[PDB]
């Protein structure tokens, strides 16, 4: 809203920090079932619902 | 739903009976556990026969008064006539029942006799003595069977 | 032929225990037999593999090859022996993963703890 509560801003900060692709050195680990970031969020696709 | 010539049935399954169905899958496991508990209790208790001496007693209800069976405990009169006090009999392994009364001299005499037999056939260890290992027997009932007069 | 109620013959449980064994358990799991000479010299049959042990490969395509252990890759359930490698097409070299049950220890890397282990297992003259 541009006048947001600190709680909201903290949640947005966490969302920004976790808005990234999978680290590439994962997928090199020994067993590594993980293929991609399946929890990736985008502002144009799925809203955080606060 | 009354079809051809069959007996009228009274199957009581109109409640949520499937919520209370006890299948005794643990019959064998419980038998094993009971035997284990009897063995552990025998080892834990003194070389004492795992059960108290019970009196002979007449069953009520003429359907069963023709037979005799083990009762709960010897009456106070029976213990006194056998020469013990109730507290000491309870400590030396005699079941004592204050509720039961003696109105039958034959049953009273049989109970006094088996109390005397038990006193003659048991060895009470001293409180602070040696009492060399006396080869625990496990069943006072088997040692002193109830005999039908 | 198991007799104790504390051991499980369940294949699912055994496989889970193997594949999720921690590093310390994997050390025991990755044991190698001693060679004939070492068995005679030490009085013991097998020992957990160690990074500086010398081994001889007795099974597989690398059979007959010898070297010193390079790493006990406990995560991979395998050991890597120096000079037992695969030369890739690009010129690089990668270690060959070997299982210690397919090797014989021809020279133990010894220290106080290893000597104590040998004596505890019933070894003579260390």
């Amino acid at each position: 809203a541009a006048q947001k509560s600190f709680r909201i801003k903290q949640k947005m900060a966490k969302a920004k920090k976790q808005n990234r692709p999978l680290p590439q050195w994962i997928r090199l680990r020994t067993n590594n079932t993980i293929r991609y970031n399946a929890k990736r969020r985008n502002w144009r696709r799925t809203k955080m619902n606060i | 739903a009354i079809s051809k010539n069959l007996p009228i049935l009274k199957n009581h399954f109109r409640k949520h009976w499937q919520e209370r169905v006890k299948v005794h899958f643990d019959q064998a496991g419980k038998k094993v556990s009971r035997r284990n508990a009897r063995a552990t209790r025998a080892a834990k208790i003194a070389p004492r026969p795992l059960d108290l001496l019970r009196p002979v007693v007449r069953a009520p209800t003429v359907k069963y008064n023709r037979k005799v069976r083990a009762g709960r405990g010897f009456t106070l009169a029976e213990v006194k006539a056998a020469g013990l006090t109730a507290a000491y009999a309870r400590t030396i392994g005699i079941a004592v029942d204050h509720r039961r009364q003696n109105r039958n001299q034959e049953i009273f005499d049989a109970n006094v006799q088996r109390l005397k037999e038990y006193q003659s056939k048991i060895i009470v260890f001293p409180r602070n003595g040696k009492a060399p290992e006396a080869e625990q027997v496990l069943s006072a009932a088997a040692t002193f069977p109830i005999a039908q007069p | 032929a198991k007799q104790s109620l504390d051991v499980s013959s369940d294949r699912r449980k055994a496989r889970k225990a193997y594949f999720t064994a921690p590093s310390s358990q994997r050390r025991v799991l990755l044991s190698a037999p001693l060679s004939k000479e070492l068995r005679a010299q030490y009085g013991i049959k097998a020992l957990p593999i160690r990074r500086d042990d010398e081994v001889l490969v007795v099974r597989g395509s690398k059979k007959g090859q010898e070297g010193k252990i390079s790493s006990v890759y406990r995560l991979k359930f395998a050991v890597q022996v120096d000079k037992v490698t695969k030369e890739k097409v690009n010129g690089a070299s990668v270690p060959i993963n070997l299982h210690p049950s397919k090797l014989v220890i021809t020279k133990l890397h010894l220290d106080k703890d290893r000597k104590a282990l040998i004596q505890r297992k019933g070894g003579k003259l260390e």
């Binding site: - | 003194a46 070389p47 004492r48 026969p49 507290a87 000491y88 309870r90 400590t91 030396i92 392994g93 056939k121 048991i122 060895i123 009470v124 260890f125 409180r127 009492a131 006396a134 080869e135 625990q136 027997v137 006072a140 040692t143 | -």
Partner: protein, 119 residues
């Protein structure tokens, strides 16, 4: 390879405080360096050294307070034993072994006797 707690335990609280300050200065310098240098892992050792020094300092302080409260009832609650809440609320061994005078008399007079059937 960092500090060792058994080595720190031989030092006075002033020496430990000074070493803690030095380790914090070293960590600050290391994280200044981290911005330029790619992937230096030496920060972890200093962080664990700071943790070890703090642990030993707290061990010394808590032991001092334990000595101060030795013997007397009403020690501090974080120095009291942490069993479960129910276990802390349970009767002590003294209680729940308390018996009345009548009960003690009769249990001394007629204890469970040791006996065997011998036939």
């Amino acid at each position: 390879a960092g500090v060792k707690a058994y080595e720190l335990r031989t030092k006075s609280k002033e020496q430990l405080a000074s070493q803690l300050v030095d380790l914090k200065k070293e960590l600050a310098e290391l994280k200044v360096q981290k911005l330029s240098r790619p992937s230096l892992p030496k920060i972890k050792t200093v962080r664990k050294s700071i943790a070890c020094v703090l642990t030993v300092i707290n061990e010394q302080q808590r032991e001092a307070v334990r000595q101060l409260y030795k013997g007397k009832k009403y020690q501090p609650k974080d120095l009291r034993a942490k069993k479960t809440r129910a276990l802390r609320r349970a009767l002590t061994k003294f209680e729940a072994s308390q018996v009345t005078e009548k009960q003690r008399k009769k249990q001394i007079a007629f204890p469970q006797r040791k006996y065997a059937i011998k036939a």
